[PDB]
Amino acid sequence: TSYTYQATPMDGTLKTMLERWAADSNMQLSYNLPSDYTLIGPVSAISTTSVQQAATELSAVYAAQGVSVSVSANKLLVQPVPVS
């Protein structure tokens, strides 16, 4: 096999990969960062049928850059990490 969330040869950047995941899922992408970013090596570990798992793995990859990736309704949401 079934569809899996992963990086593929088509995807060069964080935003563009997520545009594909969103299109593949009938979801909105809200990309709330000032710049796109290249995909870094650790993204190559992601391969899962679960959008929650995939988004969360991706979030962890970009956490040290200050980024959160999450599933919010029909949206993939990329934003600065909200903290109290």
Author numbering: 51 to 134
Paper's wording?
To better characterize the globular domain, we cloned and purified a recombinant fragment encompassing residues 51–134 (VirB7XAC2622_51–134) which was submitted to crystallization trials that resulted in large plates which belong to space group C2221 and diffracted up to 1.0 Å. Molecular replacement was performed using the solution structure of the VirB7XAC2622 globular domain as the search model. There was clear electron density for all residues, with the exception of the first amino acid (threonine 51) and residues 122 and 123 in the loop between β4 and β5. As expected, the crystal structure is very similar to the NMR ensemble, displaying an average root mean square deviation (RMSD) for the backbone heavy atoms and all heavy atoms of 1.05±0.05 Å and 1.61±0.06 Å for residues 53–130, and excellent agreement with the backbone 1H-15N RDCs [Q factor of 0.187 (regular secondary structures only) and 0.272 (all residues)]. The globular domain is composed of two α-helices sandwiched between a mixed three stranded β-sheet on one side and an antiparallel two-stranded β-sheet plus a short 310 helix on the other. The VirB7XAC2622 globular domain has no significant sequence similarity to proteins of known structure. In addition to the canonical VirB7-like N-terminal region, VirB7XAC2622 has a C-terminal region that includes a globular domain (residues 52–133). This globular domain does not interact with VirB9XAC2620_154–255 but does interact with an extended region (residues 42–49) that immediately precedes the globular domain in another VirB7XAC2622 molecule, leading to the formation of homo-oligomers. As expected, no cross-links were observed when the experiment was performed using VirB7XAC2622_51–134 which lacks the disordered N-terminal region.
In well-characterized T4SSs, VirB7 is a lipoprotein attached to the periplasmic side of the outer membrane. In order to understand the unique structural features of Xanthomonad VirB7, we have solved the solution nuclear magnetic resonance (NMR) and X-ray crystal structures of XAC2622, which we now call VirB7XAC2622, and studied its interaction with VirB9. VirB7XAC2622 presents all of the characteristics of VirB7: predicted signal peptide and lipobox sequences followed by a short and extended region that contains the VirB9 binding site. However, unlike other VirB7 proteins, VirB7XAC2622 has an extra domain whose topology is strikingly similar to that of N0 domains found in proteins from different multi-subunit complexes involved in transport across the bacterial outer membrane.
